[PDB]
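User: Can you predict the 3D structure of Fatty acid-binding protein 5? Sequence below.
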Amino acid sequence: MATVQQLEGRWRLVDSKGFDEYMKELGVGIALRKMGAMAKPDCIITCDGKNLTIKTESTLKTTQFSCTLGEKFEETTADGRKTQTVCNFTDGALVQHQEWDGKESTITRKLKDGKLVVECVMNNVTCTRIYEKV
Ligand SMILES: O=C(O)c1ccccc1NC(=O)N1CCc2ccccc21
Ligand SMILES: [Cl-]
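Assistant: Sure. Here are the predicted structure tokens for Fatty acid-binding protein 5:
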């Protein structure tokens, strides 16, 4: 018995795995990759019913989106991509699908050992983003 509300709270990055390779796959330039690779974002996740809000905060940039689960919406990512996106909660994991310019990326968010595991995949390049509850 798992629900999207299990992901709510305030989270802080504690481990990164393959993030540079994921940014390279997005085409992010060297300057922003150096900036991105030193950030330790803080994330606040809230979900009232099906209305979900994720606000990501760091010393470099603050980003946030609000959406209804299962309903598509437009999101401008931290690296500047204007994407068509939908979020679905399925099998104890929040699934975010991003499309832009004929390219796809999937971002999954799930709890593992109490840590929020964020997996970003694009063109078979997998990035793992580990957050601790604060
Ligand atoms: O970083 C992440 O784990 C992340 C995971 C999934 C989706 C977006 C992410 N990143 C993000 O939303 N932001 C906002 C500001 C900032 C600065 C530096 C690196 C990242 C970010
Ligand atoms: Cl996140």
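Helices lie at 19-26, 30-36. Strands lie at 9-17, 42-48, 51-57, 62-68, 73-76, 82-90, 93-100, 103-112, 115-122, 125-133.
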